[PDB]
Design a protein around this ligand. Structure first.
Ligand SMILES: Cc1cccc(=S)n1O
Ligand code: NA
Ligand SMILES: [Zn+2]
Length: 257
């Protein structure tokens, strides 16, 4: 099945998921000189005061921090969005080395990692129905650079030892995702897709300009996770990023001058 290695990595995905070569695939390179300021964009509204995390799971590709999405508790609205999008999970993509790991790039620059906060459009009732729609998802993407530690990340780092291998999960209640946000909500936005199979073209991407800083010790702990399951040969979970895809007939808009 699909993964990130020589034989089942991104260059193979199109055989099981032909939309890999579609018209609105993600990630993309953000050319900052080509992205036009759009004064009709709104500030993003990120309302995470009532977010209820439940669990963390190693799915064999990354780890997911999952939320209770059965009530309007943690929502994204405003920005380029019409309506209200509910947080369902977050996860990261990261590298084997600090010079790579992000999926979007900025003027070809790769960051050490990228956080994706995944939200679904409540007009479609559930996440499964939302991913059948071209406006079903909104993903808030946040770059990570290595430097000072991010205090708000440490509870996630410290639980990873308990979910080393594929299929492991741990209770993960009362985690506050506001601690993962940078100061500024300035962003770029474009229409795109999931960056993992099934690569569905449902996503309004909202990519923050300001990275957060994490410490080298924090990212090193991500890199001790495993893609394999318990009692299988160890394959470190690193380099779980898809490279940039063709922009095609799309425009990247900036919320800021
Ligand atoms: C599972 C998922 C949902 C939305 C975006 C991305 S990159 N992923 O992986
Ligand atoms: Na849920
Ligand atoms: Zn992702």
């Amino acid at each position: 099945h699909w993964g990130y290695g020589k034989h089942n990595g991104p260059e193979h995905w199109h055989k099981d998921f032909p939309i890999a070569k579609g018209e609105r695939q993600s990630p993309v390179d953000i050319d900052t000189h080509t992205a036009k300021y759009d004064p009709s964009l709104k500030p993003l509204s990120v309302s995470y005061d009532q977010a209820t995390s439940l669990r963390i799971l190693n799915n064999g590709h990354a780890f997911n921090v999952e939320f209770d999405d059965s009530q309007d508790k943690a929502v994204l609205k405003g920005g380029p969005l019409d309506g209200t999008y509910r947080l369902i999970q977050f996860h990261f993509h990261w590298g084997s080395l600090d010079g790579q790991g992000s999926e979007h790039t900025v003027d070809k620059k790769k960051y050490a990692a990228e956080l994706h906060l995944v939200h679904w459009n409540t007009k479609y009732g559930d996440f499964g129905k939302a991913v059948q729609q071209p406006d079903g998802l909104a993903v808030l993407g946040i770059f990570l650079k290595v430097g000072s530690a991010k205090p708000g990340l440490q509870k996630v780092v410290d639980v990873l030892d308990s979910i080393k291998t594929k299929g492991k999960s741990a209770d993960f209640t009362n985690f506050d995702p506001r601690g993962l946000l940078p100061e500024s909500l300035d962003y770029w936005t474009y229409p795109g897709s999931l960056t993992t199979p099934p690569l569905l073209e449902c996503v309004t991407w909202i990519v923050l300009k300001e990275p957060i800083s994490v410490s080298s010790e924090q990212v090193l702990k991500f890199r001790k996770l495993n893609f394999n399951g318990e009692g299988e040969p160890e394959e470190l979970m690193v380099d779980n990023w898809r490279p940039a895809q063709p922009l095609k007939n799309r425009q990247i808009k900036a919320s800021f001058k």
